[PDB]
Amino acid sequence: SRQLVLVVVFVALLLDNMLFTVVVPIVPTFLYITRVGVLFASKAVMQLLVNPFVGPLTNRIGYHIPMFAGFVIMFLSTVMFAFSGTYTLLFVARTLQGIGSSFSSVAGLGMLASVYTDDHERGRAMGTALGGLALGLLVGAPFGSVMYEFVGKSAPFLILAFLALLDGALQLCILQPSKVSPESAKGTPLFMLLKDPYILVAAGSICFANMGVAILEPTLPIWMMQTMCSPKWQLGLAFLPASVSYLIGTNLFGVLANKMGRWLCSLIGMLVVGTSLLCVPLAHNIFGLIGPNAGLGLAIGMVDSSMMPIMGHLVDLRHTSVYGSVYAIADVAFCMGFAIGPSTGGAIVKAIGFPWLMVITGVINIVYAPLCYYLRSPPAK
Amino acid sequence: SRQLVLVVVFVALLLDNMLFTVVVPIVPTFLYDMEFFLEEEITRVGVLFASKAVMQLLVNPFVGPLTNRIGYHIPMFAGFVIMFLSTVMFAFSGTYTLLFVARTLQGIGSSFSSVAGLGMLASVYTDDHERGRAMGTALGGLALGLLVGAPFGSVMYEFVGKSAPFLILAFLALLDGALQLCILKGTPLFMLLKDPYILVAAGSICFANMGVAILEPTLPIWMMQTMCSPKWQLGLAFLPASVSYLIGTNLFGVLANKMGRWLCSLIGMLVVGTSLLCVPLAHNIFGLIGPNAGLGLAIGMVDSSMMPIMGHLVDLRHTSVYGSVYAIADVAFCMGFAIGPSTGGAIVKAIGFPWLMVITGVINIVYAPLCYYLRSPPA
Ligand SMILES: COC(=O)[C@H]1[C@H]2C[C@@H]3c4[nH]c5cc(OC)ccc5c4CCN3C[C@H]2C[C@@H](OC(=O)c2cc(OC)c(OC)c(OC)c2)[C@@H]1OC
Ligand SMILES: NC[C@H](O)c1ccc(O)c(O)c1
């Protein structure tokens, strides 16, 4: 039944981020710049304030009930999006989407770590989970775009709700969301784990790579309109190479980094993240961003697939075998990088500028890259 | 004949590089043989290896006016003589002090020979494209000397005794003198290190070359301490470095201009740092074929991407001469070979060699973002 758990996480993370990326191409057309920016950040902020309360929560109720709650909140958010047509209602739906995604991500990654106890196999299970995440990000944009250009606004949200119902049936079949079972092992407190430089280094690498992508997310279209003066239909396709490379890289490197070397995988991934971010503000046309964006996506996939099991290896080597808090910290890094991007990108660009922002991010990644060597062989307990 | 000057300069540079890289795997073994504990003498070994760089740095400014005053053949002949004494002293020295004098003489003679021979080659070939054919051939001979000398002394220290390779090199030096025996300005360097762009390029070259500069005095001792390899493999381990450097320099001289020189230099510095980090984890001679080959390829990348950048920087702003790119990278070379081995003894005494490799790799990686300064430099 171990494989069956991965199937849910493949589909749980598939649909959780499908609404996260299907709402972007329907909101600015529907409501028709700062006001729209704060809307997207609602998922990031609200999940950040709930992650510390979710980590220890999984130590007493298990990963099943939080996942079922995330499913329920997914259903409610998508159905509310299907009907609500005001700024406040969309903000509430976004906040619900963020909180439910918090449960879904944390519980899914924790249960994936728990049910897989071999580092080599767990480096491929998480790789395929991140591949499903990349597939969801790939399919979110064209889905909503096409069925808003044709079927109607409530159509894609209704279809996603039906797929969520299928997900609930699947979780009733295999995940068993019926009873609360506390974890036998007592996880270490979060503020012990924040004092461990190894977990700090891993979380920092993840947070800095995802900050490199997150800052690029909203800031890139503004730079495109300012410099290249390009139509709208290909702006979403601009990030398509990055997401495709992320999917390919997460699968391949979940296969490969176990034999390549985890520390080396993270180091080279951060180095290519830095180099790609340096080269990104140098492109003079849409074709010029295929290379740097593809490299950045592959690098972020490398960092994710190499540090996602590295957290489990660290917690198994030093701390106890309770997995909620470490992935709570990792998702906190993810979500903080997500939050810092859109709410502050305009101010950062107006103050220093996009090229200097990318240079700063890339230099931080490069200078931080050697610190990943600290995880080559962390001492045991 | 003009080709005679080419062959004599080729032999001179080849012999200089051969001596430099043949003193590498013999001095640690030679010192160990006398006693039969190298952590106490590592500092003196580093100072000995840096003596040539220090002495060359001291004597470099005088050679210019010295060459102007008396000519080229006499200082070039002086290099032959001092190299002969260096080879003979290496063949017969038994104490540390004698070897130090031999290395200092080798440095003085190397400076004399290199400067005088390159000046004579420039004087004879006034085609202005010839140097590109003749200078390229001379540098290829330098690369061949680096390729051959390191395993040479490694190969023939357990087979033909101790002074055999040095005697052969002295005999070749006699042939080099015989070949030459039947024969017949702008922007001084002190103002070329006041520009931050050229300083960035020179620092890149020096920090990339420091990976091998530190390796030369301490790697054979590390091998004899941890792996217990045979005495004819210590100089063999540097064979992958030479092969990788030749492959990388050719390939990237072909291929670097299309992807951008700054990107090639940045990637090369990053891979230099990664390879120097990977070096301490090698657990046998076979394990070092990967990291050492990668480090050699990385240094070749850095050189092939920096030398054209140095040429462009010198041409756009200052008035460049045939040796401006040679001089600036040379000063980086001597500075690296003097500051690496000199502080290497102290660093390995305080902390292990792996920490030294980690430190050098970290400096290279952190300096790597500084290569953005050279992306389209403006007057
Ligand atoms: C030692 O003797 C040197 O110092 C030469 C080499 C130094 C260093 C090195 N030592 C080793 C020792 C080993 O065993 C212990 C094994 C491997 C290595 C390697 C591999 C890496 N490496 C580089 C070697 C290359 C030489 O430099 C040039 O070839 C050159 C080329 C140019 O144009 C193309 C120039 O510009 C016209 C120029 O002038 C500035 C110089 C350099 O200086 C003459
Ligand atoms: N884990 C998500 C990752 O940061 C990412 C990669 C590529 C993207 O186009 C994206 O929106 C997010």
Coordinates of C-alpha atoms in Angstrom, one line a residue, chain A residues 168-355:
Chain A
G168 CA -12.0 12.9 -1.9
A169 CA -13.3 9.5 -3.1
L170 CA -9.7 8.4 -3.7
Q171 CA -8.7 9.5 -0.2
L172 CA -11.6 7.7 1.3
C173 CA -10.4 4.6 -0.6
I174 CA -6.7 4.7 0.3
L175 CA -5.9 7.5 2.7
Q176 CA -8.6 6.7 5.3
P177 CA -9.5 10.2 6.7
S178 CA -11.7 8.8 9.5
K179 CA -9.8 8.7 12.7
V180 CA -7.1 10.7 14.5
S181 CA -4.0 8.7 15.4
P182 CA -1.1 10.5 17.2
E183 CA 2.4 9.9 16.1
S184 CA 4.2 7.4 18.4
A185 CA 7.5 9.3 18.2
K186 CA 7.5 12.7 19.9
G187 CA 8.8 15.3 17.4
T188 CA 11.4 17.7 18.6
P189 CA 10.1 21.3 19.2
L190 CA 10.5 23.8 16.3
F191 CA 12.7 26.1 18.3
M192 CA 15.2 23.3 18.9
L193 CA 15.3 22.7 15.1
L194 CA 15.8 26.4 14.4
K195 CA 19.0 26.2 16.4
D196 CA 20.5 23.4 14.3
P197 CA 22.7 25.0 11.6
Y198 CA 22.2 22.0 9.3
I199 CA 18.5 22.3 9.0
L200 CA 19.0 26.1 8.9
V201 CA 21.3 25.6 5.9
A202 CA 18.9 23.3 4.1
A203 CA 15.9 25.6 4.7
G204 CA 18.0 28.6 3.7
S205 CA 19.0 27.0 0.4
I206 CA 15.4 26.1 -0.4
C207 CA 14.2 29.5 0.6
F208 CA 16.8 31.3 -1.4
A209 CA 16.2 29.3 -4.6
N210 CA 12.5 29.7 -4.3
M211 CA 13.0 33.4 -3.6
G212 CA 14.9 33.6 -6.8
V213 CA 12.0 32.1 -8.7
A214 CA 9.3 34.0 -6.7
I215 CA 10.8 37.5 -7.2
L216 CA 11.2 36.7 -10.9
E217 CA 7.5 35.6 -11.1
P218 CA 5.7 39.0 -10.9
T219 CA 8.7 41.3 -11.7
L220 CA 9.4 39.6 -15.0
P221 CA 6.2 40.6 -16.8
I222 CA 6.7 44.3 -15.9
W223 CA 10.2 44.2 -17.2
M224 CA 8.9 42.5 -20.4
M225 CA 6.4 45.3 -21.0
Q226 CA 9.0 47.9 -20.2
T227 CA 11.8 46.6 -22.4
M228 CA 10.6 44.2 -25.2
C229 CA 7.0 45.6 -25.5
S230 CA 5.5 42.2 -26.2
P231 CA 1.9 41.0 -26.6
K232 CA 0.1 39.3 -23.7
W233 CA -0.6 35.7 -25.1
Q234 CA 3.1 34.6 -24.7
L235 CA 3.8 36.1 -21.3
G236 CA 2.5 33.0 -19.6
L237 CA 4.4 30.8 -22.1
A238 CA 7.6 32.6 -21.1
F239 CA 7.5 30.7 -17.8
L240 CA 6.6 27.5 -19.7
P241 CA 10.2 26.5 -20.3
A242 CA 11.0 27.0 -16.6
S243 CA 8.2 24.8 -15.5
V244 CA 8.9 22.1 -18.1
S245 CA 12.6 22.1 -17.1
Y246 CA 11.4 21.9 -13.5
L247 CA 9.4 18.8 -14.2
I248 CA 12.1 17.1 -16.2
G249 CA 14.8 18.0 -13.6
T250 CA 12.8 16.9 -10.6
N251 CA 12.1 13.5 -12.1
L252 CA 15.6 12.9 -13.5
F253 CA 17.4 14.2 -10.4
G254 CA 15.2 12.3 -8.0
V255 CA 16.5 9.4 -10.0
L256 CA 20.1 10.6 -10.2
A257 CA 21.2 12.8 -7.2
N258 CA 21.3 9.8 -4.8
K259 CA 24.3 8.4 -6.8
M260 CA 25.6 11.9 -7.9
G261 CA 25.9 13.2 -4.3
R262 CA 23.3 15.3 -2.4
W263 CA 25.7 18.0 -1.3
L264 CA 27.1 18.4 -4.8
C265 CA 23.6 18.4 -6.3
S266 CA 22.6 21.2 -4.1
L267 CA 25.8 23.2 -4.6
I268 CA 25.7 23.0 -8.4
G269 CA 22.0 23.7 -8.4
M270 CA 22.5 26.9 -6.4
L271 CA 25.4 27.9 -8.7
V272 CA 23.2 27.5 -11.8
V273 CA 20.4 29.4 -10.1
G274 CA 22.8 32.2 -9.5
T275 CA 24.2 32.1 -13.1
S276 CA 20.7 31.9 -14.6
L277 CA 19.5 34.9 -12.5
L278 CA 22.5 36.9 -13.6
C279 CA 21.9 36.1 -17.2
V280 CA 18.1 36.7 -17.1
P281 CA 18.2 40.5 -17.0
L282 CA 20.5 40.4 -20.0
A283 CA 18.1 38.9 -22.5
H284 CA 17.0 41.2 -25.3
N285 CA 14.0 39.2 -26.6
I286 CA 11.5 36.5 -25.6
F287 CA 13.8 33.9 -27.2
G288 CA 16.7 35.0 -25.1
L289 CA 14.8 34.0 -21.9
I290 CA 14.4 30.4 -23.0
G291 CA 18.0 29.5 -22.0
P292 CA 18.3 31.3 -18.6
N293 CA 14.7 30.4 -17.6
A294 CA 15.2 26.8 -18.5
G295 CA 18.5 26.7 -16.5
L296 CA 16.8 28.4 -13.6
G297 CA 13.9 25.9 -13.6
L298 CA 16.3 22.9 -13.9
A299 CA 18.4 24.3 -11.0
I300 CA 15.4 24.9 -8.8
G301 CA 14.2 21.3 -9.5
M302 CA 17.7 20.2 -8.6
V303 CA 17.7 22.1 -5.3
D304 CA 14.2 20.9 -4.4
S305 CA 14.8 17.2 -5.3
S306 CA 18.2 17.3 -3.5
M307 CA 17.2 19.1 -0.3
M308 CA 13.8 17.6 0.1
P309 CA 15.2 14.2 1.2
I310 CA 18.2 16.0 2.7
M311 CA 15.9 17.3 5.4
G312 CA 14.7 13.8 6.2
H313 CA 18.3 12.5 6.2
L314 CA 19.3 15.3 8.6
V315 CA 16.3 14.7 11.0
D316 CA 17.0 10.9 10.9
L317 CA 20.7 11.5 11.6
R318 CA 20.4 13.9 14.5
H319 CA 16.9 14.3 15.7
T320 CA 14.0 11.9 16.2
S321 CA 12.0 10.2 13.5
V322 CA 9.1 12.7 13.5
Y323 CA 8.8 14.5 10.2
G324 CA 6.2 17.3 10.7
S325 CA 8.3 20.1 12.0
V326 CA 11.2 19.9 9.4
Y327 CA 8.8 20.0 6.5
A328 CA 6.9 22.7 8.3
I329 CA 10.1 24.8 8.2
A330 CA 10.6 23.9 4.6
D331 CA 7.1 24.9 3.6
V332 CA 7.7 28.1 5.6
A333 CA 10.7 28.8 3.5
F334 CA 8.7 28.1 0.3
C335 CA 5.8 30.3 1.5
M336 CA 7.9 33.2 2.8
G337 CA 9.7 33.3 -0.6
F338 CA 6.3 33.3 -2.2
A339 CA 5.0 36.1 0.0
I340 CA 8.1 38.5 -0.2
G341 CA 7.9 38.5 -4.0
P342 CA 4.6 40.1 -5.2
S343 CA 3.9 42.4 -2.3
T344 CA 7.3 44.1 -2.4
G345 CA 8.4 43.6 -6.0
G346 CA 7.1 47.0 -7.2
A347 CA 8.8 48.8 -4.4
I348 CA 12.1 47.0 -4.8
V349 CA 12.1 47.7 -8.6
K350 CA 11.3 51.4 -8.0
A351 CA 14.1 51.6 -5.4
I352 CA 17.0 49.7 -6.8
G353 CA 15.7 48.2 -10.1
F354 CA 15.1 44.8 -11.6
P355 CA 18.6 44.1 -12.8

